[PDB]
Structure 1
Amino acid sequence: NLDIIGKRIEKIKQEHETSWHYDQDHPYKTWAYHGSYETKASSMVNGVVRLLTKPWDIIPMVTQMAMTKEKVDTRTQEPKEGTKKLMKITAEWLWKELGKKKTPRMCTREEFTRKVRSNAALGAIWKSAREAVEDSGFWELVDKERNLHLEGKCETCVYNMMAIWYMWLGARFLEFEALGFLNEDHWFSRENSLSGVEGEGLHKLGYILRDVSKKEGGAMYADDTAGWDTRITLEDLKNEEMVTNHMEGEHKKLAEAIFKLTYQNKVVRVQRPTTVMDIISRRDQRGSGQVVTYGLNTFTNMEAQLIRQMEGEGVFKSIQHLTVTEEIAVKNWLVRVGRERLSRMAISGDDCVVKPLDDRFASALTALNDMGKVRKDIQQWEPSRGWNDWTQVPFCSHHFHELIMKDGRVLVVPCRNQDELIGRARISQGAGWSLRETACLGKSYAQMWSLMYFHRRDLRLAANAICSAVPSHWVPTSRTATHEWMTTEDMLTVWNRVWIQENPWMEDKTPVESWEEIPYLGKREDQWCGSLIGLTSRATWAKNIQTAINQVRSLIGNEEYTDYMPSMKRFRR
């Protein structure tokens, strides 16, 4: 206990010696409380996108998105011995498969520096990250902590609750040095993991689900976990740490210390209004950089789902205890069919789709419930509802349509309710946005829509409008998947590269010559997915779109603009 977290606690106590109140009115039950001390970010509207989406100003599902816990303080029972055994064997086998064609390695100050100078979310708390990285005293702070970790101790690796947990860049660097390889070297690529989709892109996910649908077997299951990060057990963290069994030298020691000192024994600071700072600690649950969180969530989800598959296939009889012959059967299933069973899944962190061998999977719930991965919105022992059609399966907040081009070629396209897409593009985060920076964020949403959602009538029109309203040469930006729309290249050229040239599911590579060759959903199916086609508000907006474009051009001023509206049939004279 205080053995490992004491130093971090001691150091914070001193820095606030004149306010160390041990509140007895502390609300924590499952989080150990240590002490307290004295201390003291809304969604803004993007005006460029809102001025060009007027019909949505009266749609509450869009307008409410711009307005405006008790699951972090929960406990997870210890799994049974049969469950623990199944997890240990599966985890051991899975790190070996992921490691067959990859080599664990340390990520570098050099690589970390480049990532900070290209504005990548690292959950940090010198002003900006940029100025800390170009000064050397910081790296001496990193070195002192680095040397403390090699010694098996920790001083400065403390979480700041805000449920996301920021850290001092020094802690982030040390996490990235030891475990960044999982993301930097694509351990969860589909080629390397079989179930993963890391680096895939939203224009690949529907093709991937259609490929899973082609396997013989049962329904497609897509069960969501209730609060996945809160259900990560200490047994889960131990099975994840076994990646260090594949490491050597410094790296092995540096990685072992991240897992022991910061993952399996955390220290957190949380603001309470009664405003004081609450210094609490817990060994279990997920708390780590969002990028390491993604890869280890993928790993543990792949593990859990292969065990749910083993349960449905009768590989083991009970989670209470695994007979010595069951152990051999589980390991033999893995060697014989493990890679085929991974191929029956698409897993993106806590998000999965599984096409099992048959529907016995639907009621194979004992291992899943006992690992703590309790399903959301369903009674603990009620059998899973499966999907009969890959086009109805939810995955990564989307569903996927099969869309046939006038020339017979087949697109599998990503889709979601259009109110969600318009409502998100109308929101910015943070202060100090110039009109130019607001315009360039609108342009990023517009180009994403032209590439991913070209099949939705309202979005291809609004995307053309925004791109006409923002100066042609201004570069799309974001402050916070592969992002092919982040470019000043012509969007028809990018569309051809993504959907035809580089698309491994498209055998005929004939380029498309104009946007009019590129199809929409059926008119009814566009409505079903939230389109306003057919409403008087929408018809007036489309007819008068040049007036809206000219309003935004007048605000931005006398700049070079291109009219993209004649790329659409109806504006082609």
Structure 2
Amino acid sequence: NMDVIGERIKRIKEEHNSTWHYDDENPYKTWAYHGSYEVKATGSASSMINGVVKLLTKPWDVVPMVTQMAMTDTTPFGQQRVFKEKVDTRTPRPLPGTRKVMEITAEWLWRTLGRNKRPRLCTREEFTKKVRTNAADSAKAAVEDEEFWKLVDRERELHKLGKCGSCVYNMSRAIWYMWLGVRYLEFEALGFLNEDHWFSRENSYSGVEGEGLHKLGYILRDISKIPGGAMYADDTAGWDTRITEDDLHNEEKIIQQMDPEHRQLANAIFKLTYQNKVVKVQRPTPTGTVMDIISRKDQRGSGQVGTYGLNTFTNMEAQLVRQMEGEGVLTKADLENPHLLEKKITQWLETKGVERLKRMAISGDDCVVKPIDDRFANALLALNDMGKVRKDIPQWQPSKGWHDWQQVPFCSHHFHELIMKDGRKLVVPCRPQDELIGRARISQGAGWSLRETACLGKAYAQMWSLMYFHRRDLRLASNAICSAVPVHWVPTSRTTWSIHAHHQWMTTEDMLTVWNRVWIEENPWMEDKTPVTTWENVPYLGKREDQWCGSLIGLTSRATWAQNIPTAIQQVRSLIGNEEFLDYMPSMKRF
């Protein structure tokens, strides 16, 4: 193994030979530990609070979930704890028949996915345009420096020679350039999966990439119309730690459809950075803080360019195999059998595969499957054997499915069908309200001025106006925040890193106009394009559903807060200073 990772370690060792040592009291059990070197402590024990959101959400000061979200440990102690819990484990190898089914399915799935699209190299200008339009950090400084691109070219030349010298994954500028350069080369070779939307619903059938949170509920309602059994949505315990050497070799098969110059570079990413990896992890010690250099041959690096697409691919593959077992195509004898008959697997894929892909919604490790019947609930032999063991359930206990698409969890949400005052139907995303308020109250980092804080608050408020307007507390809070923040201040910083976020709220455009564009105009499931001219005609969940999903409506603390909210808005306004504000409260029946 040292012939693939040796150069990378040698470079770290030489760069840090001042403090380099072999700490023989390292906690690594399943990862190969190479050595340590002293570093400054990174991360925080708690998170900075957004004072603007906090001052306008007083009844949530006494909410346990809200308080918990303000915590989250990112220090060396925090990193080490989570590492021990999941990351430091070994997945038993799948049986020979299981490996054969996975291989046949992976081959057919890659050909299906590549039927209209062809893989291609991503460029320096694509990465630059992304880094720019995202930041509008020190990544933009690297992208602007020609010296960064020269290091990129030098690493690429090693990659063409089947070698790696600096591509290290992380759990002054030279160390930073090497990380961003590793991510650029990964983007260059595998970015086409995201950039050319290989996992869009039109291309992949099961996929939802590029669809957006505002479309997922509509997709789940469409799946519910397909005849079959219940809708299943099983969670895998630590999916990324369950990616096997067999899964990686199956994912690699995409290189067969590439141009030779592209195949060479993607092969280097697969063989040197995915199937072999050098990882940096911070660890506290009595002496101080050290960086451990570790390695392994399996699992997925969660921060990588290809992670989402390759998890989506492998999960679509694992769900087709579970569907086959449910249908009696795959038996216990077949999974143990090295000489398993390929014919019936190939016949099922070619005649039923695509129809079976359409019964699913798959986003990385998140899946929803509507099998042809409920034998699937008890079809666990292949799922467990592939290493995709379901979270917090005995291994052989049958899965519990849902007979209502509205009860189905998917991508940290559930979805409600609403009836508007004009009789039109809307399908909206939803989650427990404490999680929404709890997140909005967290600002990211330190040294943030009241201006930047108010603008992040405005971004959260506007995200709620577009996605979660159907929650009474969030519409009130959203209007209060937008009334407290100067009208012309542009929402800055992101509210989420979610691939499902299209960030329509990142604007100073009127939110009712944006609402109309998203839910009416561009909405494929909205036949009648009549605009909604007032927020008074923008619907809410039924009062009972709003309460079931965490609303404080009907509580006295909530009525007190609503009644006294112009006072809290005025307090925020007075501290922000003499700027132009707009009273958004009259857009509600209360004012």
> Please, which moves more after superposition, 237-246 or 111-120?
111-120
C-alpha contact (below 8 Å) 1:180/1:292 kept by paired residues:
yes
Shift of 1:119: 3.0
Query: Using the alignment, how far apart are the partners of 1:117 and 1:522 within structure 2?
Result: 42
- Give runs of aligned pairs for residues 14-413 of structure 1, distance below 5 A: 14-40=14-40, 41-42=43-44, 43-68=47-72, 69-70=83-84, 71-119=86-134, 128-161=138-171, 168-274=179-285, 275-287=289-301, 289-317=303-331, 318-321=334-337, 323=339, 326-413=341-428
Query: Using the alignment, how far apart are the partners of 1:330 and 1:478 within structure 2?
Result: 48
- Give runs of aligned pairs for residues 480-495 of structure 1, distance below 5 A: 481=500, 482-495=502-515
Query: Using the alignment, how far apart are the partners of 1:209 and 1:532 within structure 2?
Result: 28
Please name the residue that 1:497 is paired with: 517
**1:259-311 deviations in Å (ceiling 9; x for gaps):** 00000000112222122222111010001644421111100000000000011
| Letter aligned with residue 321 of structure 1 | N
Query: Using the alignment, how far apart are the partners of 1:322 and 1:346 within structure 2?
Result: 31
Shift of 1:26: 2.1
Please name the residue that 2:462 is paired with: 447
SS in structure 2 at match of 1:489: coil
The gaps in structure 2 that reach 5 residues or longer are 73-82
| Letter aligned with residue 477 of structure 1 | T
Shift of 1:56: 1.1
**1:288-340 deviations in Å (ceiling 9; x for gaps):** 6444211111000000000000111111222011656x311111111111111
Shift of 1:37: 2.3
Query: Using the alignment, how far apart are the partners of 1:63 and 1:245 within structure 2?
Result: 50
Query: Using the alignment, how far apart are the partners of 1:18 and 1:446 within structure 2?
Result: 50
Shift of 1:82: 0.5
Please name the residue that 2:546 is paired with: 526
Query: Using the alignment, how far apart are the partners of 1:434 and 1:559 within structure 2?
Result: 16
Query: Using the alignment, how far apart are the partners of 2:514 and 2:36 within structure 1?
Result: 54
Shift of 1:4: 0.7
> Please, which moves more after superposition, 221-230 or 427-436?
427-436
C-alpha contact (below 8 Å) 1:54/1:541 kept by paired residues:
yes
SS in structure 1 at match of 2:18: helix
Query: Using the alignment, how far apart are the partners of 2:405 and 2:31 within structure 1?
Result: 42
C-alpha contact (below 8 Å) 1:263/1:288 kept by paired residues:
no
Shift of 1:527: 1.1
Aligned length: 561
Query: Using the alignment, how far apart are the partners of 1:512 and 1:36 within structure 2?
Result: 61
C-alpha contact (below 8 Å) 1:425/1:442 kept by paired residues:
yes
Q: For residues 148 and 179 of structure 1, do their structure 2 counterparts lie closer, same or farther at Cα, with a shift above 3 Å needed?
A: same
% of aligned pairs identical? 79
Q: For residues 428 and 175 of structure 1, do their structure 2 counterparts lie closer, same or farther at Cα, with a shift above 3 Å needed?
A: same
**1:313-370 deviations in Å (ceiling 9; x for gaps):** 111222011656x311111111111111111000110000000000000111111111
Query: Using the alignment, how far apart are the partners of 1:17 and 1:57 within structure 2?
Result: 49
**1:44-66 deviations in Å (ceiling 9; x for gaps):** 10011111111111222212321
Shift of 1:103: 1.5
SS in structure 2 at match of 1:220: coil
SS in structure 2 at match of 1:204: helix
Shift of 1:557: 0.7
Query: Using the alignment, how far apart are the partners of 1:552 and 1:524 within structure 2?
Result: 32
| Letter aligned with residue 366 of structure 1 | L
1:542 partnered with 2:562: yes
What is the aligned counterpart of 1:427 among 420, 442, 453?
A: 442
Please name the residue that 2:579 is paired with: 559
1:8 partnered with 2:2: no
C-alpha contact (below 8 Å) 1:44/1:430 kept by paired residues:
yes
Query: Using the alignment, how far apart are the partners of 1:437 and 1:152 within structure 2?
Result: 46
Shift of 1:200: 1.1
The gaps in structure 1 that reach 5 residues or longer are 122-126
Moved over 6 A (4+): none
| Letter aligned with residue 526 of structure 1 | D
C-alpha contact (below 8 Å) 2:327/2:375 kept by paired residues:
yes
Shift of 1:129: 0.8
C-alpha contact (below 8 Å) 2:234/2:367 kept by paired residues:
yes
Q: For residues 120 and 149 of structure 1, do their structure 2 counterparts lie closer, same or farther at Cα, with a shift above 3 Å needed?
A: farther
**1:383-434 deviations in Å (ceiling 9; x for gaps):** 1011111111111111111111111110111111111111110001112211
| Letter aligned with residue 153 of structure 2 | D
| Letter aligned with residue 420 of structure 1 | E
C-alpha contact (below 8 Å) 1:172/1:289 kept by paired residues:
no
- Give runs of aligned pairs for residues 456-475 of structure 1, distance below 5 A: 456-475=471-490
Please name the residue that 1:124 is paired with: none
SS in structure 1 at match of 2:87: coil
> Please, which moves more after superposition, 550-559 or 6-15?
6-15
Please name the residue that 2:431 is paired with: 416
| Letter aligned with residue 31 of structure 2 | W
RMSD between aligned residues: 1.5
SS in structure 2 at match of 1:439: helix
Q: For residues 216 and 120 of structure 1, do their structure 2 counterparts lie closer, same or farther at Cα, with a shift above 3 Å needed?
A: farther
Structure 2-normalised TM-score?
0.93
Query: Using the alignment, how far apart are the partners of 1:199 and 1:291 within structure 2?
Result: 15
